[PDB]
């Protein structure tokens, strides 16, 4: 077996889950257009009653130039003109823990 669920049983498992979730359905035939319209209006869902989206759409210069000029040949600050994650610190902590644990045996 190994795996918790072989693919071939996926359809049966989903069928049983759906049967459990929806135990009762509306299975009463109508007789004309008005009844169907009324039933559609009655059964509307809050989550499926939105509206269609909207179409997709598209003096200080001297100071900025002076700042840009003064920041010439700056290796790092020039490009910007920042989400720390502390990855090196965590790597150091992990390696220190591993080394100490190994030294525990010896």
């Amino acid at each position: 077996d190994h795996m918790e669920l072989d693919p071939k049983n996926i359809y049966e498992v989903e069928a049983k889950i759906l049967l459990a979730t929806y135990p009762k359905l509306d299975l009463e035939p109508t007789k004309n257009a008005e009844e169907t319209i009324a039933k559609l209006e009655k059964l509307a869902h809050p989550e499926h009653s939105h509206k269609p989206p909207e179409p997709k759409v598209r003096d200080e210069a001297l100071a900025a130039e002076q700042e840009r000029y003064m920041l010439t040949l700056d290796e790092r600050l020039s490009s910007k003109l920042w989400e720390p994650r502390f990855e090196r610190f965590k790597l150091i902590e992990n390696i220190k823990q591993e080394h100490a644990e190994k030294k525990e045996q010896e």
Binding site: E4, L5, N9, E12, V13, K16, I17, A20
Partner: peptide, 30 residues
């Protein structure tokens, strides 16, 4: 067994245990 898998999944999800019409009809019947 499918029943065991279904039960496990369901537990993991916290599933607790007006007059013109009548006139025309009457004419068509007459």
């Amino acid at each position: 067994n499918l029943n065991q898998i279904v039960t496990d999944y369901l537990k993991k999800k916290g599933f607790t245990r007006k007059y013109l019409k009548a006139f025309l009809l009457l004419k068509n019947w007459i």
